[PDB]
Amino acid sequence: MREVISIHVGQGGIQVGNACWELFCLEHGIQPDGQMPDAFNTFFSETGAGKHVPRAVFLDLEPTVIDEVRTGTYRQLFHPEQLISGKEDAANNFARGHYTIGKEIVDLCLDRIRKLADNCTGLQGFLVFNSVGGGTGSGLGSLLLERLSVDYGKKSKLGFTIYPSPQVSTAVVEPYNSILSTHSLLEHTDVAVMLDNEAIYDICRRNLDIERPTYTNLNRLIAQVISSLTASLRFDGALNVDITEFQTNLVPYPRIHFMLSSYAPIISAEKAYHEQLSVAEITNSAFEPANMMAKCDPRHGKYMACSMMYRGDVVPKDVNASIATIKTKRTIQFVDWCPTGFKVGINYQPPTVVPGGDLAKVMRAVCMISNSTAIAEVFSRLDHKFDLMYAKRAFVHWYVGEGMEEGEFSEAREDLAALEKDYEEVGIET
Amino acid sequence: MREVISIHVGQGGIQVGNACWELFCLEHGIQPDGQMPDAFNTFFSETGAGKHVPRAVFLDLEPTVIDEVRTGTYRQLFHPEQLISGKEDAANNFARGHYTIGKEIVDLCLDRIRKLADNCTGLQGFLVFNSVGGGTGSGLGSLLLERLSVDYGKKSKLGFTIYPSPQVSTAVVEPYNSILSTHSLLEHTDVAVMLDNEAIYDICRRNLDIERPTYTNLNRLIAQVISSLTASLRFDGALNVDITEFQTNLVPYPRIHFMLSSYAPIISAEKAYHEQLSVAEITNSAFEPANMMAKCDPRHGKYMACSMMYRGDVVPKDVNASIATIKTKRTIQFVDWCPTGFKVGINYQPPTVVPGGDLAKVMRAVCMISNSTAIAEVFSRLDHKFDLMYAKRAFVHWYVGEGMEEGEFSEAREDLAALEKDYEEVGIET
Amino acid sequence: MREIVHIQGGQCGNQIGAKFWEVISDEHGIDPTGTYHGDSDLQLERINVYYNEATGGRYVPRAILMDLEPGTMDSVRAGPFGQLFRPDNFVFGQTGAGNNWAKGHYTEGAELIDSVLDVVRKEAEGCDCLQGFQITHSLGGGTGSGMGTLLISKVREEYPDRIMETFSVVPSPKVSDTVVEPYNATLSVHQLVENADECMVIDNEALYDICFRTLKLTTPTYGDLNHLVSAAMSGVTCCLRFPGQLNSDLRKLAVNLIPFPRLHFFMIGFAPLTSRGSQQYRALTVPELTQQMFDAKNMMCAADPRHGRYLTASALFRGRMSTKEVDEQMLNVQNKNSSYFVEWIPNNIKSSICDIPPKGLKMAVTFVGNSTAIQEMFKRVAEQFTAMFRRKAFLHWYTGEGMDEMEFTEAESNMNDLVSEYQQYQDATA
Amino acid sequence: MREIVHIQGGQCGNQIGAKFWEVISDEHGIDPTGTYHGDSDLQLERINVYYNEATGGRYVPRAILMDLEPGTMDSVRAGPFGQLFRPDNFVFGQTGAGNNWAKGHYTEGAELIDSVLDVVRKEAEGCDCLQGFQITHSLGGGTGSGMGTLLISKVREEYPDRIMETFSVVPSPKVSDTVVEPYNATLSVHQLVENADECMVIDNEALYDICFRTLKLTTPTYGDLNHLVSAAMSGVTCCLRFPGQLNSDLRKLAVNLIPFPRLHFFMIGFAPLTSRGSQQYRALTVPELTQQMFDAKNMMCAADPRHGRYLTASALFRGRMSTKEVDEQMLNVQNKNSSYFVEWIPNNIKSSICDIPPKGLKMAVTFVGNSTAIQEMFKRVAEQFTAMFRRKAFLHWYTGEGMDEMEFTEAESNMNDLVSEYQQYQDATA
């Protein structure tokens, strides 16, 4: 009687949704056709006899990815008319997907959301995935969040956004729409998790020893993180954690809800079994700055609160004996007004392996969600990138001619300045 | 609950590590695949179900030997990612492996050492193997010892170095890096054992009757010596000896810890059984100057302390009756300030035979570790060889151009002069 | 006659009860199907204390299980002895509290509590002669610490003359699993002092310390902590269910251990506790029981009892033993430790004897002592609370559901006043 | 009544106890499972001297086993009669001393000794009437000679009126197994004279001499030396466990054999001892026992008793025999050897008779004589100590753990003073 609905918008969102939906189907024993040859209820729904239907909706204005989905092996799984598709792409223009073509599509998505919500009885909250540096992704994510915040109100929404890397970039105009989308979801999303690609590339290179990774390898790691986060809702555990038990433990103030994640262990089968993978060493590896899932240095800032999930055969006393060691270290310092900052969850189900993938099978794993003061650097560098081109009003004509006003750029800049001032104000000791 | 970690660096180190790791696996009944078809815990670790993983790490900058290891019959035994390998060899240049390419590799080795140490609970100490007359071996051994001496502190480290022969040599520049490495490990290693190749060649020729030996025959004898030294930690015995019980019995002063070893009996199956191999005759053979494992004459100097291990069905009274005979002889004289100089250990497990090897199966054996004043001759001859080429500054440009300073050669010479003066000062009677 | 009903709330309380009822059923010989299969006549004489009678001859506990989420009760039903609980007594909501005290005490807990109060009233009105209620809950969670404490006030308002027990687990700063623990701990302690007739604090840190040091078992789990807590819980009411030399119900302990109505926070301990390998070495004698009973490490709380002076103490011996030995040993434990006993109340140790020992043990002791050393726990809880509250961290979650900061200030002031007036009697002299 | 507890430390002491307890159990008919299967009534009357009683009717020795390494106690448990020892009494460290007295007495032995002192206090406080303690340890090892002697002082400080026994094996210069024997022998003798009420020296060299000459067995082993020491140990307390014509507890021997409080170093011997082939030739008579009892080669020490004069002597006859013959033979052995008995104390031989002989023998004698000939052992020990100390050999190992040379100088001076004042009475005349 506990449910959650995941929203996938944009090319990156759909490509990570595919990645998480192989993993969930594999973890619950459901074949790609949707047929089994009481834990499924969190992500799926029973049709009365036979197949299961995911509680997910796919959105995009550009039809190529959806058409690829509707012809692959998973054509029989998803309901045919929840893969909403458009005709014309926003083409990396934020104003397009927020004012011009997204408005005519958003009504169908909201109707689908209502039709899925009326089925659930114990709706925990929503999940949303969107790559920020694109037109349709950021614009439609903003519009959907704004509609949901007023249609439902206090229901919790979680956002797994992928911000651009510090120096590596695929587009040339992504700072503009990244800043605008951050403006939009700052006052509209309860949790936002950092996911830039460069850090995960470094993780793959160093640990998985892959020298030529593709997007699928990144999306599989993200899917594993999602599964670790939501395992506690569908498996028995000695110390459970619910989604609603987050803003009471990781969010000191309503404005501050951007945090960065990490995962451990990450290791290949060729050298995994030569070492014992004790809980102490994995919880040490999870706190290593080089294993952050976002390219930010935690040594440059304080910690505010750490929520970290275990799964497997871990014993609570071993967890406490490792939290003490971390509190001992002099290179990790917490904020003054937080004496204890750890929330611990323990689950019994070990992580599942996907055949043909990178990760091996292990009995212990740890996933941490940590809120730290050091996150302000990404905001500062994105702001610096934005200012350089906004000084000469470059690329603005592509946005003014799509219905957006001239002054809309300035107030996003002011909100980022306010956020940066707030992060500095919080981190000073009393 | 007693453990030891062995470090293998360089080509000679890896080739003697292979030799000792066939012997240990054979002695504990473990198949080459790592599967058995409570004494193993000293060298191995249990993975929970099935295979055992050695507590050893292999280091080299030149990939050929490691690649040979990773394709032989023992490919399944070692953990895939503890065989650290480089790309570029140091090429017999000490400055390369201490200042240029070894620094970028040493961090991974230290991480592996930490990951292995956190598993052990009763860590007795470290073992290290390295051929001294090479660039990567000597340089990386020096750097690893220097890092370990400060990371761990009082933990005991044992070094089985192979110094060059008096006249037989493979390189032309090995005195330089031999002297520098002796400088480095003089103040950093608790025990150093002499292992030059010429003496072992003579041993093989005289006893084993092999006229064309290769390196494997030498390494098997070294492996047997290591097994005899560490047998007391993993087998029941009437008179046990631990590793930590050495600096209290063989090391009169902190500077003096270079000693030379011997082994007995060494005999082939074709003529072994024709003679009774009593304890008296084997303990007489062990003290013969021609059976020293290093090409040094003990008749040229005093003894300081003798630690000698037995294994098999030997009875303590027969050992005492043979120590008395040795004290009787006029050709062996001890130092004045040492009335008793013998430490005796007795173990019950007879030495194990390796199939296809040289040594036969016997019920009694003796291994002696003796500290004597005569060792100064090797230092004097190495110093004389060094001075000849350092007078004209030959081959120095290959070292100055790799980051090393000009004055670094002189202070090693001064430390050797200090050591030689100390050995003379200790050996005079009061 | 003089029976009590069981009420538990939250996940921690449900897990405690899931072992408490197993222990009680094993003590009375009740199979997991509710059928008596005991050996002794005394096993059935006073079974009305905890069990009701239904048609078909089976027995059903008079327990009431409440939580704001259905998962924990859906899991406890599948465990052993899970079928005994009447399905009608299961009451749950569909939303949960998310470790937020305000949600579990003002908005969600207020509407649901009517249904559970209905069944509570049904259970109490029916029973022959009420003795009282016993409550198990955790102070580290939102729904538990809110709904349980509000239910305490509601029950006290309707049954002012009955006795009320609470077994409360307070969040220790060593093993912290939730970041918002100080807030709902401080808020709960405010209400708990005003209504509970007896309170018994239990700490996970002390349980881990006991399991690691006295039992010396390698891997503690929640099952062992629950078993220890269950044995301690059963030991208190043993003489109320079995004959003995000096019967002493809960009200008699209430009279003799509470000097002033606001000083009713005890810490407990159970003896004997021995490792598996040393259970044959030890001999069970009254001196051996009493020396372990007053041992500082044996207390179920991290509070150090030699940092203060006992106001009073109690012991509930089990098994057949001579009373003269018990009295003389109690006198001896009070003459040799006169410095740790307050001097203006002489003879401040109460003793009781029950002739029925626990199943498998010949002698057992339950210790309940009211000491001034408990101030340290409230001191550290208030220290963390005031460290976190001064910055108004995580305050918006609580203030968004009708609560204000004034109730935080009053709670802090009342808790500090309790801390001060509890130690006021420590320095008091005659 | 008047029972004693057993405490042993080190490897040598553990091996001595492993045979002492076997001998005691065989004497009292206790099976290795702790079940009595004896034949005579007297076998159970005074079993409380060494054995405790537990539920189920089995018996458990009141022995305490301590060592700084776990190997020896992990090995003694698998031997015969190894299950009798209570697992709780096993206390051990994880590091060991390495034959270094400083480590086993200042740094490592100081922290561990609290746990063993706890169980020692538990054992002594409980027992009916304490007689005293008996200690078995070796002076040739570090951990033994350090921790045992510090424990002697700690026990003496808490029980000043009880009696204390120590069976000490001193390192002989003939059969030397450790090079650092003189240092920890000299340091231990300093502390041993100040606290031990009785001391009994035993030498491995004398045991080998006895085994080779009197028993004439070909291959002595540690099992035979342990058996002889165990028989000698059992002979002392025989009359305290069995009836006899003249009972004489340990305190009575203490009164009659120690003239001055600092002269309490005895050497012992056991009779009869005959070879297997000559056990039928000999006839057991009191003259035959007394002629072998005073034989110089029969002493358990290499010290030659006709190189000095006896201050006093004692004999503990076993079996049923006439007292008139015993007294006349004692007079005859004192009239024919008047030159070797000091003249200013007449009638300096004590005799006792016990009617219960050893199992398998009809008569037996235990001899304990205080003689001035013991000076030779301290003379040679001090000679080796001063030969090694003048060069400060191996001194850094001791001085690196907080010890200094001043404690060496004081120990040497006190030992020499003991040597001098022990022989002072040899030349004394009336």
Ligand SMILES: Nc1nc2c(ncn2[C@@H]2O[C@H](COP(=O)(O)OP(=O)(O)OP(=O)(O)O)[C@@H](O)[C@H]2O)c(=O)[nH]1
């Ligand atoms: N991690 C991850 N990021 C992706 C992936 N695909 C695209 N991105 C990121 O998405 C950003 C651009 O947005 P896209 O998702 O590609 O396109 P869009 O969101 O659909 O917006 P449009 O361009 O209007 O179609 C790029 O900067 C990429 O970094 C992916 O498969 N994995």
Ligand SMILES: Nc1nc2c(ncn2[C@@H]2O[C@H](COP(=O)(O)OP(=O)(O)OP(=O)(O)O)[C@@H](O)[C@H]2O)c(=O)[nH]1
């Ligand atoms: N006993 C023994 N000595 C060896 C063996 N292999 C090489 N050596 C000695 O090692 C010396 C040179 O060092 P190597 O180990 O061969 O090479 P390295 O230590 O890896 O140093 P690099 O030349 O930089 O690779 C030679 O003088 C040999 O005497 C061996 O298998 N057994």
Ligand SMILES: Nc1nc2c(ncn2[C@@H]2O[C@H](COP(=O)(O)OP(=O)(O)O)[C@@H](O)[C@H]2O)c(=O)[nH]1
């Ligand atoms: N003894 C014991 N304690 C537990 C168990 N499960 C959780 N806890 C403790 O309960 C605390 C969390 O309480 P919580 O589950 O949030 O209570 P709730 O909010 O009422 O559901 C943790 O700090 C744990 O130490 C258990 O099975 N046994």
Ligand SMILES: Nc1nc2c(ncn2[C@@H]2O[C@H](COP(=O)(O)OP(=O)(O)O)[C@@H](O)[C@H]2O)c(=O)[nH]1
């Ligand atoms: N009688 C006897 N003596 C032993 C035995 N084992 C060792 N020893 C003696 O003990 C001495 C070494 O003591 P050691 O083992 O180092 O004592 P530790 O340091 O306390 O462990 C040697 O000189 C041996 O003569 C044994 O089984 N029986």
Ligand SMILES: [Mg+2]
């Ligand atoms: Mg697109």
Ligand SMILES: [Mg+2]
């Ligand atoms: Mg090489």
